[PDB]
């Protein structure tokens, strides 16, 4: 059924699975026209498709050309997502195809089920988890490749860098979700916490800075603090 706090360890077992987040597929700026009406301008988007066990990120860049001459784009965006995920599964060797795909938004269930009818043994699941994958475009190197794309493109990343050398997938996913939650709640504050000390750099082949185990504990503490403060101001609590 639905993925929740009760069945959380299932994310780190040996059954291949992917999270799919469609939040950043269809992106617009809203603006006034010369006549004082409102119009949208699409900007490049991305599908966020993540193996939470390995950290492998399949970032399908959605070029604005996709939307030209199409109607009902928020509806089309869910179907285009399902089409691209389906195309990705078909492109993988059988032994690498996922057993389950977990969609971060319930509106993706029907489009993905319909595109995956050919794969009756792949389970399409919702989740009760409120995952902060919308904040993916706060990761500077991911934002860069999306906004520079001139055509449809798939780019592969490891969102955990080399962390799995030192920590389990459970711990790596917990750190990822804490960093993205912080970036979603107060992007400027989160980015300052990550990039303030200039001695700690981001390797060319990495997304996040090269923190020692001790520095990750401090960073993780600074992120939890940022999130609780912002909760207090929100709810006047």
């Amino acid at each position: 059924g639905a993925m929740n706090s009760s069945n959380y360890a299932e994310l780190f077992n040996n059954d291949i699975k992917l999270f799919v987040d469609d939040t950043n597929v269809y992106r617009v700026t809203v603006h006034k026209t010369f006549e004082g009406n409102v119009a949208t301008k699409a900007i490049n988007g991305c599908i966020f498709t993540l193996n939470p066990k390995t950290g492998h990120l399949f970032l399908k860049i959605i070029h604005t050309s996709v939307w030209a001459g199409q109607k009902r784009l928020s509806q089309l965006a869910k179907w285009k997502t399902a089409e691209e995920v389906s195309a990705l599964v078909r492109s993988l060797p059988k032994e690498e195809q996922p057993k389950q795909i977990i969609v971060t938004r319930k509106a993706m269930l029907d489009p993905l089920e319909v595109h995956m009818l050919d794969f009756p043994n792949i389970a399409i699941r919702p989740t009760e988890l409120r995952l902060p994958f919308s904040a993916a475009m706060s990761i500077d190197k991911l934002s860069d490749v999306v906004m520079k794309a001139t055509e449809p493109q798939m780019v592969l990343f490891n969102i955990y860098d080399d962390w799995l050398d030192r920590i389990s997938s459970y711990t790596a996913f917990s750190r990822l979700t804490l960093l993205l939650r912080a970036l979603k709640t107060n992007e400027e504050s989160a980015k300052m916490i990550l990039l303030s000390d200039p001695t700690i750099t981001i390797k060319s082949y990495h997304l996040w800075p090269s923190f020692t185990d001790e520095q990750w504990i401090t960073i993780e503490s600074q992120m939890r603090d940022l999130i609780l403060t912002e909760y207090g101001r929100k709810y006047n609590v």
Partner: protein, 300 residues
């Protein structure tokens, strides 16, 4: 002007004949139903006074043979049978009519209700949905499951309705996923109408049979079939104008006939709300929308 005689009525029972019903007492000198209109299928149905929770009956057409009812004390039910000796049968009906121990099919001259509910229903199509080839009549009851329900366990006693599944390869053309899921016109027109039913009369005949089994027996799988066939039309942007006009008449009479107190268990809120207010055909079913809004505004 046909007759279905009864050997006897040994157990207290409610007897339905089409949309009508009457009570018979244990060992009441009741010997059947006369003046049954030729030209239509009919259904004779039973609920025992001692078991209100179960309903069973027989679809038949008096043009296909001489049929009678006889209670079986072993299987504990009223059974339909064919009498192959026409002279013996005429001799039996004449005697019971002379002694006036038969109820008359109580049709009002003005009243087209039964024609209106059975317009496209044909015995040869009933016998393909309900398979018992050695009989010319078809048994249905409350508990019989559909082929569709069975796939999600005795095939011999199932309702073989045409399987409709909006999330199936049959329903969705490779490369037309979003188009075919949001506009079911291809599934309705090419797969079902051209492909399986051959024409809209056969499609309507199955829709009308499914409703009647849902109403008369409380058959849950029949109710699911009726709603799926309405939803397939309502969710299609491209339907022939004659089909929409006929569907509106069909549903009007079904909603008019439904018992007011069963509106809650016989009508699916989601399907009706979608069909009348959201679907491509939301403005196409004037007669149906008016009777539903005036009779069951709570459902909507």
């Amino acid at each position: 002007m046909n007759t279905v005689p009864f050997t006897s009525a040994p157990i207290e029972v409610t007897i339905g004949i089409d949309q009508y019903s009457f009570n018979v007492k244990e060992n009441q000198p009741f010997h059947g139903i006369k003046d049954i209109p030729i030209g239509h299928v009919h259904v004779i149905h039973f609920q025992h006074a001692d078991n209100s929770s179960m309903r069973y009956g027989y679809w038949f057409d008096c043009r296909m043979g001489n049929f009678y009812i006889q209670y079986d004390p072993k299987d504990g039910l009223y059974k339909m049978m064919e009498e192959r000796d026409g002279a013996k049968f005429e001799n039996i009906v004449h005697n019971f009519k002379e002694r006036q121990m038969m109820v008359s099919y109580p049709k009002i001259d003005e009243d087209d209700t039964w024609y209106n509910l059975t317009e496209f229903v044909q015995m040869d199509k009933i016998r393909k949905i309900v398979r018992k080839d050695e009989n010319q009549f078809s048994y249905v009851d409350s508990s019989m499951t559909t082929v569709q329900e069975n796939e999600l366990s005795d095939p011999a006693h199932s309702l073989n309705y045409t399987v409709i599944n909006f999330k199936s390869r049959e329903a969705i053309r490779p490369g037309h996923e979003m188009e075919d899921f949001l506009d079911k016109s291809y599934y309705l027109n090419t797969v079902m109408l051209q492909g399986i039913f051959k024409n809209s009369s056969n499609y309507f005949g199955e829709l009308q049979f499914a409703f009647l089994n849902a109403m008369f027996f409380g058959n849950y799988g029949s109710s699911l079939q009726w709603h799926a066939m309405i939803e397939l039309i309502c969710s299609s942007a491209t339907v022939p104008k004659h089909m929409l006009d006929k569907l509106d008449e069909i549903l009007y009479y079904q909603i008019k006939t439904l018992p007011e107190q069963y509106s809650d268990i016989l009508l699916n809120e989601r399907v009706w709300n979608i069909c009348l207010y959201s679907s491509f055909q939301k403005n196409s079913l004037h007669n149906t929308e008016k009777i539903m809004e005036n009779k069951y505004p709570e459902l909507l």
